Design a protein around this ligand. Structure first.
Ligand SMILES: O=C1CCc2ccccc2N1
Ligand SMILES: [Cl-]
Lengths: 301, 306
């Protein structure tokens, strides 16, 4: 027993991280088959980033403008292209460490592991949720750009995130591996803010199930509720509405514990109104919303 | 910026994880060079669990009683010996993925990454601290025994923990990679219970220094404290005593923020007296004790957000 924020094992991804230099900018690349993926903004001076014309800045570049380094080994760049906000550097050499992989775009409320990297060197791994406002609460310093987010499904790595920028609130924004941003953000030094965030209701409920499974049960109560009744409480507390879809996904945990979701919603309803009455739940003073039902099921069974 | 419970990249350890089977018992082992390390309790049966005589149960074992499996490759065991509470199986192949490694025994307050493993397959990685009571607050189901804790400071894998058992209060107990338990625990299912746990004070201060580096200032105060007065207050909240050593170790974070250790101690005394009054620090509504001064410097910039 016990419950911890748990990343996927990162070795399949560690094997794919390279260093990418274009002028003065160094940051991180993802080396899969014979292509290296990184943020298109690598090609930008400071003056460039104020109002970049990537079409124009890119044609101006050539293959030898891109210094791709896998450890001590220069890869030869033999082609460059842009897909949305992601640069694709064709290389002479396929990655002999390429895993079974796909590119996936995740939904807000879904979690993934971030492998923070610096100068192409894996540094750290932590679990993150794609916030309802399409930010992630990351831990990123200069050089972190091109660090990737992923899930592992059996042996297949699902790449969902590439790190692009920090916002002025200290939260992080990036793209899927097809270069489409998560959230209403652009790769340009300009005025950009994190939309007001909301709490991921289905995840909070998954985490209360995990707490119950680990013998933390004080917050439980005889009551139940209805979607409508709860969702008006949720709405007030800046909580995502709970759909009939979320209640079904919780069915396993509702089964294993003998609390029905609307029974647990009753517990959560009271915690929002009345607080935690000084206690903690799985060593947290907060209602933790970055564990999915699947994260709780995967970890606890 | 940002601040996260951050584990080390687990790939160097993934490449060393194997399945060890003895009798009806399967757990994980650590395959380094020609040796697989696993908890010696793998060789116990039902009765053996209370008063195992490990030297007696081991002398009765042949190499071919130990079934080792690296993915699909069956490693052939060519030798066995015991060191304290760790079993060492010699095998006919040195693990080709053996990294630069070393074995270190850690002190309470130290942090490491745990690569949770079932049937020799890694399932996840997370950060833990050695609690002052010599347990760790892990996430370990049945079959997790032989999972290891590690640091990877500068391309060398320091192995510091191997998981042996869950105590009745849901906390976890294990050995160094030389098979010596952390704490007064033994690999017998006789009644044992962790000592009352305390908050890792030096770690809480390092985390407050992290909050200030990340731009949070609301909890500072115009006050200071003597080291002695801080200890007499902190210990009434079940906090570890802060030593001069702990004071010295915080000097660098003190220097980077320009807040004296004992000023930051006054802030902690007040946080302990007031709680958070609806606020949060680096995303937590409690005082966090599982980041070391070293962890704070590693994760944080060299520039403060003043
Ligand atoms: O860590 C552990 C060791 C073995 C075990 C057995 C039964 C329930 C939980 C556990 N957890
Ligand atoms: Cl130590």
């Amino acid at each position: 027993s016990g419950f911890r924020k748990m990343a996927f094992p990162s070795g399949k991804v560690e094997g794919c991280m390279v260093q990418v230099t274009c002028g003065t900018t160094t940051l991180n690349g993802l080396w899969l088959d014979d292509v290296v993926y990184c943020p298109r903004h690598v090609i930008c001076t400071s003056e460039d980033m104020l109002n970049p014309n990537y079409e124009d800045l890119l044609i101006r570049k050539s293959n030898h403008n891109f210094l791709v380094q896998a450890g001590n080994v220069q890869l030869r760049v033999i082609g460059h292209s842009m897909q949305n906000c992601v640069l694709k550097l064709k290389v002479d050499t396929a990655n002999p460490k390429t895993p079974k992989y796909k590119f996936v775009r995740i939904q807000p409320g879904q979690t993934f592991s971030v492998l923070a990297c610096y100068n192409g060197s894996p540094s750290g791994v932590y679990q993150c949720a794609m916030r309802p406002n399409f930010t992630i609460k990351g831990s990123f310093l200069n050089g972190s750009c091109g660090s990737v987010g992923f899930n592992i499904d059996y042996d297949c790595v699902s790449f969902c995130y590439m790190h692009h920028m920090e916002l002025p609130t200290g939260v992080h924004a990036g793209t899927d591996l097809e270069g489409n941003f998560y959230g209403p953000f652009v790769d340009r030094q300009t005025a950009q803010a994190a939309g007001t965030d909301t709490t991921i209701t289905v995840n909070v409920l998954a985490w209360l199930y995990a707490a119950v499974i680990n013998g933390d049960r004080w917050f439980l109560n005889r009551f139940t509720t209805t979607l409508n009744d709860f969702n008006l409480v949720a709405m007030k507390y800046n909580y995502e509405p709970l759909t009939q879809d979320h209640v079904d996904i919780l069915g396993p945990l509702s089964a294993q514990t003998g609390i029905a979701v609307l029974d647990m919603c009753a517990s959560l309803k009271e915690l929002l109104q009345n607080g935690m009455n000084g206690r903690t739940i799985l060593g947290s003073a907060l209602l933790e919303d970055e564990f999915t039902p699947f994260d709780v099921v995967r970890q606890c069974s």
